[PDB]
Amino acid sequence: GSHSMRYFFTSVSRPGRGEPRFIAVGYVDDTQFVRFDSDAASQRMEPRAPWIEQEGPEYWDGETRKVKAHSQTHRVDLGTLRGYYNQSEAGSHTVQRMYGCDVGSDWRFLRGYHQYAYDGKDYIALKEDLRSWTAADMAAQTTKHKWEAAHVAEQLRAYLEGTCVEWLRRYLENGKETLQRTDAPKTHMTHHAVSDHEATLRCWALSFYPAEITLTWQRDGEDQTQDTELVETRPAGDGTFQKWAAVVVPSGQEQRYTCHVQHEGLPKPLTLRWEP
């Protein structure tokens, strides 16, 4: 299957009450493997997946060094962005950064990422060519010219197309029993009357990994996209995922509706009808 390694960083300024709260998390697909919290006691990058624990002290020293440096950059960026937007010194603001790489099922490099957000909105992002920048507004154009002069893209591209991808392949191997598995969803359907003429049919998908799934309803082979209540895919908390999809049907016409389940664990997609 397709795989990814992504790092996520969030810095939230708290003026008057000290230095910004910095949080860094690392993921291989939908599994977190590292973490850093500026308010935690260790002041170290810590393991979060059993397959990363086997890395020696030099690995953790380097990760702790680079993660504290990432946090310092964001601390300075918070002050700058406040000036770019003529914002008050007392308010709390957020910078977010995301970067990483993807590999296809052939394990060859597919995509690199490096993007930045200020206060939950796009600020600057590296384009798919790993050479150009997309600046969201006028303030981001100042940063864009600064990063072009400093040749930031040339440096990021060497990491994304090489280092990022080599370490992702090594993590996929070290964690092969969890990272390279497919848990097919366990499905069921519930039925609840809502009037003398209507009932809700809820199609369930549970204990699946990875999170990528399609759960849809049809009535006589026609998509029910508008009449479908769908929940966002949620973590079970044990490394698996859950999702449901519901439709309001006329009682007696339950057999005209089919729920369709699509997942890597299912060789052939599933068609499910209400079973009284």
Binding site: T73, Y84, K146, L156
Partner: peptide, 10 residues
Amino acid sequence: KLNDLCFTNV
């Protein structure tokens, strides 16, 4: 592994 690069400020 994190990117071993001193980022440029905004």
